[PDB]
Amino acid sequence: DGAPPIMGSSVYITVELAIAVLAILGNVLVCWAVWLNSNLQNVTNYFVVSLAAADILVGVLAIPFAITISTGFCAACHGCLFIACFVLVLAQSSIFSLLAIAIDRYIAIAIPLRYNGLVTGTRAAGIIAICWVLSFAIGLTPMLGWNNCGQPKEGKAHSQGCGEGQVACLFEDVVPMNYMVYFNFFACVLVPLLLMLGVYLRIFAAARRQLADLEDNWETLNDNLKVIEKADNAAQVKDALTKMRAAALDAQKKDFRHGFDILVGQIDDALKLANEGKVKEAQAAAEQLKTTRNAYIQKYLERARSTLQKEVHAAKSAAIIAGLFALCWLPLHIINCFTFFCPDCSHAPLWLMYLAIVLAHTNSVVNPFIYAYRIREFRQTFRKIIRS
Ligand SMILES: CC(C)CCC[C@@H](C)[C@H]1CC[C@H]2[C@@H]3CC=C4C[C@@H](O)CC[C@]4(C)[C@H]3CC[C@]12C
Ligand SMILES: CC(C)CCC[C@@H](C)[C@H]1CC[C@H]2[C@@H]3CC=C4C[C@@H](O)CC[C@]4(C)[C@H]3CC[C@]12C
Ligand SMILES: CC(C)CCC[C@@H](C)[C@H]1CC[C@H]2[C@@H]3CC=C4C[C@@H](O)CC[C@]4(C)[C@H]3CC[C@]12C
Ligand SMILES: CC(C)CCC[C@@H](C)[C@H]1CC[C@H]2[C@@H]3CC=C4C[C@@H](O)CC[C@]4(C)[C@H]3CC[C@]12C
Ligand SMILES: CCCCCCCC/C=C\CCCCCCCC(=O)OC[C@H](O)CO
Ligand SMILES: CCCCCCCC/C=C\CCCCCCCC(=O)OC[C@H](O)CO
Ligand SMILES: Nc1nnc(-c2ccc(O)c(Cl)c2)c(-c2ccccc2)n1
Ligand SMILES: CCCCCCCC/C=C\CCCCCCCC(=O)O
Ligand SMILES: CCCCCCCC/C=C\CCCCCCCC(=O)O
Ligand SMILES: CCCCCCCC/C=C\CCCCCCCC(=O)O
Ligand SMILES: [Cl-]
Ligand code: NA
């Protein structure tokens, strides 16, 4: 009752080739956009390009390799091992790029004053090169001896007419499942993804605190102004002014500096009048602070808030990319856990394996769409490339 295998194979192969074309076209566009637009040439987007390069190689190499290993063709076992393991290199490189992007965004939100001195393009290129070497080491670890080539399935090889030293080339026949679950999934995929989640939680928590701090200093500026107006002695004016002077410097950490120079100076003017017991003169001097607040301080408040909201928006776009990676790759890893941990369970059917593989490959298509829909500089650059 077995339908011809070439029928179901043709559907799987046709879908894979369609995904490969789309993965190449979209991510080549990403690389072409960063190359052309200097506004897109930053450390964050160098890891984006490294991530796009991995997705280009999914369509050029990993998908042709996946098509090849689905046939079970006769091959030298270590040759079969290489084409089976190469996708692990690309997946690992993607994980390193995703983790670097999250860390890069955390440095920008937590220590922006020393970000440009710490995170440079030259150091980013060196990190990218190191992560690619580690991705080959991790993904090709089975070629170092942790494989099933020492125990070939000779009955399957003889039935397919394979020569001596050859095996029917199938992923689960050469790559050990304990490597795939413990080493690749748990250690090399799950742990970095959980680290990324922790980094993004710290990014959004840091942004929420900084936006709260901005609003607290703005309220303290306006509350103590009311305290001075309804004060009854010079000591009460002095108490409210001392809190404003420290909060003004706390919020200060050309037109920006001039606005705060006026503010602290006007606070000092009113403070000197308060220390001399001149309540009415100190209150009138403190009323001049409202002119500085409307013309300078509120504009800084708004611009600083706008910058934080743009960093939140960019961190969400990056987190969506990392989340979609997890969504597309987790089914394959969960299936391997069932194969490995439940030998009394029937193996997941072949059609489900193909579907899980196609889903993982589709992740190499989605990133250019996230950039186009969420990052205006990419979207506008994409339009210029396509129109021209
Ligand atoms: C620079 C880039 C484009 C070169 C890509 C080289 C690829 C296509 C080459 C490099 C090593 C090759 C493999 C090496 C060994 C074997 C064992 C043999 O029994 C069947 C073919 C097989 C499995 C080869 C398939 C093709 C292969 C994967
Ligand atoms: C870009 C260039 C420098 C990459 C060079 C990669 C070369 C050195 C590597 C990549 C994969 C390797 C092959 C992978 C598997 C096998 C099958 C084994 O039964 C004999 C060796 C053979 C055929 C290897 C020979 C060396 C090989 C071809
Ligand atoms: C949100 C996403 C990541 C969740 C993905 C859940 C998927 C991968 C899970 C949900 C139910 C699972 C299946 C439940 C039962 C069986 C029967 C067993 O004999 C083989 C595995 C198999 C076929 C499982 C394979 C993996 C599976 C399809
Ligand atoms: C998504 C992140 C946060 C966690 C990943 C959850 C993974 C590791 C969990 C979710 C569901 C789990 C499976 C659920 C059911 C079974 C059947 C049992 O007979 C053996 C273990 C096995 C196969 C589990 C292995 C581990 C498993 C795949
Ligand atoms: C610009 C592109 C850059 C470079 C692009 C390279 C693309 C690689 C394509 C296919 C690899 C498939 C290779 C595996 C084919 C094996 C078939 C085979 O070997 O069959 C005889 C064997 O002895 C069984 O009995
Ligand atoms: C699975 C196999 C795992 C392999 C386990 C061992 C791998 C080595 C690990 C890291 C090397 C880190 C790179 C060190 C290269 C030198 C960097 C450097 O010189 O730069 C300092 C710089 O001045 C500051 O910006
Ligand atoms: N049992 C099993 N079978 N096939 C693959 C496989 C092979 C080639 C590919 O191109 C892709 Cl995407 C998947 C994986 C597998 C699972 C997780 C990570 C890497 C490979 N696991
Ligand atoms: C708008 C961009 C258009 C790009 C065209 C890409 C379309 C890809 C469609 C199908 C790929 C496979 C075609 C033939 C597969 C043969 C099936 C088989 O024999 O296994
Ligand atoms: C831009 C360069 C892209 C590379 C082009 C490769 C496209 C070919 C697609 C799939 C390769 C199929 C491998 C053949 C399977 C072997 C079948 C068998 O021998 O039994
Ligand atoms: C078989 C490999 C296993 C060990 C992995 C070694 C780690 C990577 C080794 C060399 C990477 C070379 C590039 C280093 C330059 C650093 C530049 C910089 O950080 O500023
Ligand atoms: Cl935007
Ligand atoms: Na990827």
Swiss-Prot record:
Positions on the Extracellular side per record topology: 5-10, 70-80, 147-176, 342-349
Any one GO biological process: central nervous system development
Cytoplasmic-facing ranges: 36-45, 104-123, 202-317
Keywords carried by this UniProt record: Cell membrane, Disulfide bond, G-protein coupled receptor, Glycoprotein, Membrane, Receptor, Transducer, Transmembrane, Transmembrane helix, Ubl conjugation
Subcellular location: Cell membrane
Glycosylation sites per record: A157
Entry comment on modification after translation: Ubiquitinated. Deubiquitinated by USP4; leading to stabilization and expression at the cell surface.
Transmembrane segments: 11-35, 46-69, 81-103, 124-146, 177-201, 318-341, 350-373
Predominant localisation class: membrane
Role description: Receptor for adenosine. The activity of this receptor is mediated by G proteins which activate adenylyl cyclase.
Protein name: Adenosine receptor A2a
The species this protein was found in: Homo sapiens
Record lineage: Eukaryota, Metazoa, Chordata, Craniata, Vertebrata
Positions spanned in the full protein: 2 to 305 of 412
